[PDB]
């Protein structure tokens, strides 16, 4: 149920 | 560091949130 | 947190949300004490029992958030870490003596009006301030109840406890490590904190200087808000030496 985060900070 | 502890929207501005008093109240 | 309420937005400024980035959840809370240093509890990154072991590449640090599940565009920011510590003496074996790790951030975090350090207690401030009765606050994204979770983070405050009355509350054996809070059954009030508040912060406000001191992390308890058990926190000061020797060395 958490919104997906910018993928910058999956890298 | 030497502003630890000091909320920007709370203690720098000299507004207190709604709960803090029950501390001050208990610190006897 | 069990009891409590939502915070004012900028309340708890120190607050960390750690998160797991597979899959995609709160891990613990977490506070920050400067631009690259976060405090939380060593259980949150290592518990074998529970075959829990995180490196640093399996989480990220959340600061100045709010909403438990948004991504709060503009407001909150999102760190990766250089690296754990966790407390070399840390009992993961019997009863989480000395639960506290530090992570320190790849990069340093841009304080802002939602985002700024929390103080540690020196002595003097720990022996004025940790006192049976005297009023901490602790907050989290965790449960809202022992067995349901928040959409924003939420907020207790709770008294200090006897350490007698801590330890004739439980079979576990206590040590100077830690301090217990919490309400007792005939005091009418409650609140606990829970699963998912983790690694949080008990805070304290100085009177002397009107300082926010983090006195406590949260580490353990028998269920939550349960009347006659107690919530347990480590003893930040006590550990302090640690947390010292371990910025001064690799800060
Ligand atoms: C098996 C033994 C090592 C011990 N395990 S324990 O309590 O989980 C160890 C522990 C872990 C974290 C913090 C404090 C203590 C244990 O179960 N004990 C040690 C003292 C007596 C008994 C007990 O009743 N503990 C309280 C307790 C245990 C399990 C739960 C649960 N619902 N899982 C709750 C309370
Ligand atoms: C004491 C030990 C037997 C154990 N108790 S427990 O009942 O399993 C904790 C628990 C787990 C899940 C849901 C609610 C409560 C415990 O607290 N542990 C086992 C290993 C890690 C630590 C933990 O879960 N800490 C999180 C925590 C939970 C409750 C509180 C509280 N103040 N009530 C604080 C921290
Ligand atoms: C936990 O992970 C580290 C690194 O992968 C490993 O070396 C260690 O043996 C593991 N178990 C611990 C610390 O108990
Ligand atoms: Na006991
Ligand atoms: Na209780």
Redesign the pocket.
């Given at each position: 149920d958490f919104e997906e985060i910018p993928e910058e900070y999956l890298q | 560091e030497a502003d630890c502890g000091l909320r920007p929207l709370f203690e720098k501005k000299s507004l207190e949130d709604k709960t803090e008093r029950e501390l001050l109240e208990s610190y006897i | 947190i069990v009891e409590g309420s939502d915070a004012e937005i900028g309340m708890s400024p120190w607050q960390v949300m750690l998160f797991r980035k597979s899959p995609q959840e709160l891990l613990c809370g977490a506070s920050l004490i400067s631009d690259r240093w976060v405090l939380t509890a060593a259980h949150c990154l290592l518990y074998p029992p529970w075959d829990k072991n995180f490196t640093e590449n399996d989480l990220l640090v959340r600061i100045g958030k709010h909403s438990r599940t948004r991504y709060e565009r503009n407001i909150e920011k999102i760190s990766m870490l250089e690296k754990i510590y966790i407390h070399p003496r840390y009992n993961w074996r019997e009863n989480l003596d000395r639960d506290i790790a530090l992570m320190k951030l790849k990069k340093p975090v841009a304080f802002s009006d939602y985002i700024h350090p929390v103080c540690l207690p020196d002595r003097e401030t720990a022996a004025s301030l940790l006192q049976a009765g005297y009023k901490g606050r602790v907050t989290g994204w965790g449960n809202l109840k022992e067995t349901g979770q928040p959409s924003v983070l939420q907020v207790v405050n709770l008294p200090i406890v006897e350490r007698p009355v801590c330890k004739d509350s439980t079979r576990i054996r206590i040590t100077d490590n830690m301090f217990c809070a919490?309400?007792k059954p005939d005091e009418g009030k409650?609140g606990?904190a829970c699963e998912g508040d983790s690694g949080g912060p008990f805070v304290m406000k100085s009177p002397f200087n009107n300082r926010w001191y983090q006195m406590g992390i949260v580490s353990w308890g028998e269920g939550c808000?349960?009347?006659?058990?107690?919530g347990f926190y480590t003893h930040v000061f006590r550990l302090k030496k640690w947390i010292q020797k371990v910025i001064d060395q690799f800060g």
């Open positions: - | - | 919490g309400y409650r606990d808000d349960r009347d006659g058990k107690y």
